[PDB]
Amino acid sequence: STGSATTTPIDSLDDAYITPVQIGTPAQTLNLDFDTGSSDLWVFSSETTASEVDGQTIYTPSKSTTAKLLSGATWSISYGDGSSSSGDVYTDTVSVGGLTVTGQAVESAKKVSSSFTEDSTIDGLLGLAFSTLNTVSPTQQKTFFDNAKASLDSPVFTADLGYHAPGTYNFGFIDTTAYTGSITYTAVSTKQGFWEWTSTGYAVGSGTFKSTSIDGIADTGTTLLYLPATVVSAYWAQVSGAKSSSSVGGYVFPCSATLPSFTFGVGSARIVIPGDYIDFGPISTGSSSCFGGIQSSAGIGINIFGDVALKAAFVVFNGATTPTLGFASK
C-alpha cells in the first residue's frame, strides 16, 4: 500500500504545516501537524476542556463506530517550545492520503497549553519519530508509520515541504519526479528516539564550505533551523545590522536586508537554503526589525534541522531495519 497527502502552510510565514487526516467511522477529518520530532498522535476532542478550544476541529469518539477506549491509558507530552497537552486514549481507524491503519492509538486531549488553544489552524499532532518516544502509559503505543510500515510497498515516508506553498507527505514510495539529481542517504542514530544524523558542514552565501560535523535531528514539527552558536554567528555576520536580541529571543535583522543563502552538507552533497527562506518577518506588526530563520541551539541541547532546512530538500525517512535519511535538491 501507499498514501499521499498534501501539506499546507498554516500562515504566510510557513510557521507550521497541516495535513488532513481521517479518523473514525464515518470519517472525521482533522488537520494535523506531522511532526518527525515526536511520537504521539493526539487531537483536540470532545473531551478537551471547553475553554481551551478556540476554533479547532474536534474528534468526537462517541460518534465513531470503530472507536474503542484504550482502558487505563493516559498520555502527557511537553514539547521543546514549552507547550504541552495530555489526556486519555482511544484506538480507531486512521487514514492519511488513502493509507489506512486500523487500531491506531488516537490520543484525545483533555488539556492543552495556551499556544495550542491560540492556534485555531492545528487540530493536533501526528508524530513520526520513533515509537520509543511515545508517551502513552502504562502501555506505550506505536506511531502511524510504525503501524503502517509492514503494509507499505517500501518502509519509507517522504517530506516535501513547500516554501510559501503546499507540499506533500508520501508513505510507502519515493516519487522520483519530486526531486532533481540523486538522493544522498546518510546514517541515523535512533538512540534518542529522533531521526538524528550528522551534517558534514555548511557555507554562508557564496562563501567557502566549512567541513565540520553537525549532529542534529530532522524535525518537521520545528519551524526554524537551530545550529551551534559559532555557525549561526558566522551566518548573521554577513547581514548588515543583524544582532542577537535577548529581549526578542534570538537573531533579528533589518527588514530591508537581502539575506544570503545557507548551505548544509549531506555527505558529499549540498542542500542550499535560499536567503528568502530565512526571513520570518517583522518581530511585531509594523516593525522594521525582522526575525531570523537560523537561530542558536545553545541551551536547547540538540541541533534541529527544522522546516527552514527541510523545505529546501526532498527528504526520505527510511524506516528499514537500519533506518537512514535521504536528502535531494528539488
Swiss-Prot record:
Catalyzed reactions per annotation: Hydrolysis of proteins with specificity similar to that of pepsin A, prefers hydrophobic residues at P1 and P1', but does not cleave 14-Ala-|-Leu-15 in the B chain of insulin or Z-Glu-Tyr. Clots milk
Domain Peptidase A1 intervals: 17-328
Any GO molecular function: aspartic-type endopeptidase activity
GO BP terms, alphabetized: proteolysis
Catalytic residues as annotated in Swiss-Prot or TrEMBL: D35, S199
Disulfide partners: C255-C290
Keyword vocabulary terms for this entry: Aspartyl protease, Disulfide bond, Hydrolase, Protease, Signal, Zymogen
Family per similarity comment: Belongs to the peptidase A1 family.
Name of this chain's protein: Endothiapepsin
Organism: Cryphonectria parasitica (Chestnut blight fungus)
Name of the gene this protein is made from: EAPA
